[PDB]
Design a protein around this nucleic acid. Structure first.
Ligand SMILES: CC[C@H]1OC(=O)[C@@](C)(F)C(=O)[C@H](C)[C@@H](O[C@@H]2O[C@H](C)C[C@H](N(C)C)[C@H]2O)[C@](C)(OC)C[C@@H](C)C(=O)[C@H](C)[C@H]2N(CCCCn3cc(-c4cccc(N)c4)nn3)C(=O)O[C@]12C
Ligand SMILES: [K+]
Ligand SMILES: [Mg+2]
Ligand SMILES: [Mg+2]
Ligand SMILES: [Mg+2]
Ligand SMILES: [Mg+2]
Ligand SMILES: [Mg+2]
Ligand SMILES: [Mg+2]
Ligand SMILES: [Mg+2]
Ligand SMILES: [Mg+2]
Ligand SMILES: [Mg+2]
Ligand SMILES: [Mg+2]
Ligand SMILES: [Mg+2]
Ligand SMILES: [Mg+2]
Ligand SMILES: [Mg+2]
Ligand SMILES: [Mg+2]
Ligand SMILES: [Mg+2]
Ligand SMILES: [Mg+2]
Ligand SMILES: [Mg+2]
Ligand SMILES: [Mg+2]
Ligand SMILES: [Mg+2]
Ligand SMILES: [Mg+2]
Ligand SMILES: [Mg+2]
Ligand SMILES: [Mg+2]
Ligand SMILES: [Mg+2]
Ligand SMILES: [Mg+2]
Ligand SMILES: [Mg+2]
Ligand SMILES: [Mg+2]
Ligand SMILES: [Mg+2]
Ligand SMILES: [Mg+2]
Ligand SMILES: [Mg+2]
Ligand SMILES: [Mg+2]
Ligand SMILES: [Mg+2]
Ligand SMILES: [Mg+2]
Ligand SMILES: [Mg+2]
Ligand SMILES: [Mg+2]
Ligand SMILES: [Mg+2]
Ligand SMILES: [Mg+2]
Ligand SMILES: [Mg+2]
Ligand SMILES: [Mg+2]
Ligand SMILES: [Mg+2]
Ligand SMILES: [Mg+2]
Ligand SMILES: [Mg+2]
Ligand SMILES: [Mg+2]
Ligand SMILES: [Zn+2]
Lengths: 44, 44, 120, 111
RNA sequence: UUAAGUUAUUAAGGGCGCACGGUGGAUGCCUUGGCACUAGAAGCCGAUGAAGGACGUUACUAACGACGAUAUGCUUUGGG
RNA sequence: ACCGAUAGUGAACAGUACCGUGAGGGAAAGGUGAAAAGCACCCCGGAAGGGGAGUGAAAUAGAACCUGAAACCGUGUGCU
RNA sequence: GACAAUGGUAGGAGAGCGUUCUAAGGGCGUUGAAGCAUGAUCGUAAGGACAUGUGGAGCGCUUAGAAGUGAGAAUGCCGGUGUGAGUAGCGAAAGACGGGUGAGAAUCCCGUCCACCGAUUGACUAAGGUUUCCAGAGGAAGGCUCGUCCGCUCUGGGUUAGU
RNA sequence: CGCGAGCUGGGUUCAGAACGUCGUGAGACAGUUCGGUCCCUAUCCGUCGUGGGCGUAGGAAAUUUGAGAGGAGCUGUCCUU
RNA sequence: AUGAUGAGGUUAAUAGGUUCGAGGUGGAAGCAUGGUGACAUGUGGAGCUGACGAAUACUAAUCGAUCGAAGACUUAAU
């Protein structure tokens, strides 16, 4: 129910290895800057 | 659920007010103690 | 079919509201899942309107809301009348596919995918 | 040269800001702008404003190229923490840390 | 070319060292306030309404000091 | 041959804030600079906040303002 | 020079290190004191220097004197900051769309439709609270999200009795 | 006397009450009787599933050998002889 | 659960719609007729029908972007 020992800096960052976001899937707008793929401009 | 403090202007003044304190020697002792300590509020 | 995070009665009512709003405004912005669900409702309604008979009109009245639409100049009509009038005539020679969905991207408040669904 | 901009005491926890910062570090300015515009995170417009400010510094104060700029440095430091409390059960109060960030962006032409 | 054998390159992340930042308010320096005493004096006021307060008074206005409808002060005698 | 801001009064800025029906309990909180000379003006930004330009001996002395330790949080990488 | 001795708890004995203050002597310091930081330095230990950076006005040395004189543990006291962790939770419920405003809108305004209470989720008195009421302006903090909104902030207003 | 951070809580070491018994008494028991709050968001190892990295001396698509590991393993009745 | 796996991405049946089926329900609405009426009969195995089957590009799978080798050495048979 509770941590028996505190988590070291090393273990914490090891666990955060995969905690990240990825670059959006984006494409240049041929006529109308960049946009999400399969989305309309909605602002151009 | 019902709690202990049920406010009542009249009750509060009659039990803890200035005149009730002046009414007994021990109440006057309370006022003297509070004046000696330098309290802003001496009674209700 | 999708549940849309609602009970059956709530989901049915929301789908009726969305379908009537689409019929009235011809172009609405909603979430992705709601639009994917309502495309079927709206297109089956348009099928009934193309059928045109009295029984089809009453079956359509089971689903449509009772809303009024002020047209060009102070002339009113119901959403059912528009569905069996202008909308049905617009799609006489089109065999299905009366709507399209255009994705807009996430919105600020909850990251939900906003889309436009419009009549074709 | 190098141009810099700093947004101090932004009311977003540094853990969350750094997630977005990691995307644009080392990228070209235009690519970073597109990434920030299309990234769905609360930090994105704050970071975008810091980057725009850095690019404006470049152009106006140092007459830099404005099209050959890269995001040389991008980091978030910890600002002062607003200490708050949430009532819990049994009359107990629990601490809430409303953390802040200092956000820095450095652009450069590489020369 | 094959066979048998040997040994690299990678770092998602981690470790050590170093560099540069942030946070935080220790440390040093400082004193507006204290602490303990010495010497000289004085100790207690009030129905001629006390001690302590409330409410007000400044051109502007919250609090504190001062003042009391003569109110952020009046007269007078000296100093300056 | 007393203290020097966790000390010394509880109180250097308070019997206040706050807690309690009440008697009563009772904090935290000092330092820009020699002088406000407290950053005209330009730029990004709704603002906040910044980068310049100025003031200053010093602005990593810019008011959350002397010094600014450690825990803690980041960025770069020499070896691994 | 040449022989011996030198494990150690409670505990006894001896000799020293360092901190603040005082007296006397002698010195340092804006050509940069204390403090802080770094270093591959010295001493048998406690510990002592030097160099460089930071800092910006006080401080060593010698001899002697006096102590609030040395912390790693007290479920110690106060402060700061971690971990658990982007985890638990975000406090009974029906919303949808259009239009508007705005730097920014699921969350503000307006509209239509839908839905909930209705011996009450309606209306009015009392206690209690004491300006929370109204208008205009705002969005740092507060609001368990957002916020252009607000019982929040700023400015100006508002309570009328012979019954 | 495996197993309550897996469950229950009938019994047993709780405050109420009663009987028998003992004690002057307050009370008590080689006894009995009715009633009587079961908290915890899993950090590490362990276990069940399921992904990412790199390695496997070029890179890849597919088909595979099997070192080794797990699973399975019960039995009745009747007829005939 | 999410990753993952598998079917597809216009040189396309991946999903939705449309049209037609299977199965389910059991006789729609409207109208006519009979009945004072409740109702009944006929039109007519009718109407309706999520997930199942087929056909059909009507709608959506646009454009595009990212990663990804160049085969080390030593000795033997050829
Ligand atoms: C249900 C919550 C309670 O848990 C429990 O009661 C149990 C089920 F968790 C519990 O009985 C645990 C297991 C207990 O520990 C045991 O103690 C034994 C002596 C020994 C044993 N082991 C070591 C052999 C221990 O594990 C004990 C002492 O709690 C009484 C633990 C201690 C730390 C204790 O007192 C704690 C603080 C105890 N407590 C007093 C409750 C006291 C009884 N209570 C009060 C309330 C209540 C109060 C306010 C509002 C509401 N709605 C309810 N509900 N129940 C609370 O307020 O909360 C809890 C946690
Ligand atoms: K019929
Ligand atoms: Mg669903
Ligand atoms: Mg229902
Ligand atoms: Mg409570
Ligand atoms: Mg990496
Ligand atoms: Mg540091
Ligand atoms: Mg005054
Ligand atoms: Mg200090
Ligand atoms: Mg003090
Ligand atoms: Mg400035
Ligand atoms: Mg500036
Ligand atoms: Mg400037
Ligand atoms: Mg400045
Ligand atoms: Mg400095
Ligand atoms: Mg400082
Ligand atoms: Mg010895
Ligand atoms: Mg020996
Ligand atoms: Mg001794
Ligand atoms: Mg000694
Ligand atoms: Mg000594
Ligand atoms: Mg000193
Ligand atoms: Mg001591
Ligand atoms: Mg301790
Ligand atoms: Mg903590
Ligand atoms: Mg944590
Ligand atoms: Mg998560
Ligand atoms: Mg966990
Ligand atoms: Mg979870
Ligand atoms: Mg959750
Ligand atoms: Mg709620
Ligand atoms: Mg109802
Ligand atoms: Mg109001
Ligand atoms: Mg908020
Ligand atoms: Mg207000
Ligand atoms: Mg057992
Ligand atoms: Mg049990
Ligand atoms: Mg157990
Ligand atoms: Mg029991
Ligand atoms: Mg007897
Ligand atoms: Mg029972
Ligand atoms: Mg085998
Ligand atoms: Mg093995
Ligand atoms: Mg058998
Ligand atoms: Zn575009």
């Amino acid at each position: 129910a509770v941590p028996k020992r505190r988590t070291s800096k090393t273990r914490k960052n090891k666990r955060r290895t995969h905690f990240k976001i990825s670059v959006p899937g984006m494409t240049e707008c041929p006529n109308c800057e960049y946009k999400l793929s399969h989305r309309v401009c909605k602002n151009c | 659920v019902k709690r202990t403090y049920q406010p009542n202007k009249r009750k509060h003044s009659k039990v803890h007010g200035f005149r009730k304190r002046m009414s007994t020697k021990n109440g006057r002792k309370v006022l003297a103690r509070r004046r000696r300590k330098g309290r802003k509020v001496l009674s209700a | 079919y999708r549940k849309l995070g609602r009970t059956s009665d709530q989901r049915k009512a929301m789908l009726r509201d969305l379908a009537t709003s689409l019929i009235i405004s011809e172009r609405i912005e909603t979430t992705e899942a709601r639009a994917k669900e309502v495309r079927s409702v709206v297109e089956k309604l348009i099928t009934l309107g193309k059928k045109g008979d009295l029984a089809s009109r009453r079956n359509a009245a089971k689903t449509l809301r009772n809303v009024e639409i002020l047209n060009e100049d102070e002339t009113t009509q119901t959403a059912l009348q528009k569905l069996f009038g202008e909308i049905a005539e617009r799609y006489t020679e089109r065999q299905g596919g009366y709507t399209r969905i255009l994705k807009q991207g996430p919105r600020r408040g909850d990251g939900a995918e906003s889309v436009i669904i419009e009549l074709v | 040269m190098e141009a810099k901009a700093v947004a101090r005491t932004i009311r977003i926890a540094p853990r969350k800001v750094r997630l977005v910062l990691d995307l644009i570090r080392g990228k070209n300015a235009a690519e970073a702008i597109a990434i920030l515009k299309l990234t769905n995170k609360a930090s994105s417009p704050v970071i975008e404003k810091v980057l725009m400010s850095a690019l404006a510094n470049a152009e106006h104060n140092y007459d830099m190229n404005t099209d050959e700029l890269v995001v040389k440095e991008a980091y978030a430091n910890e600002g002062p923490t607003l200490k708050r409390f949430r009532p819990r059960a049994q009359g107990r109060a629990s601490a809430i840390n409303k953390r802040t960030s200092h956000i820095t962006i450095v652009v450069s032409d590489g020369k």
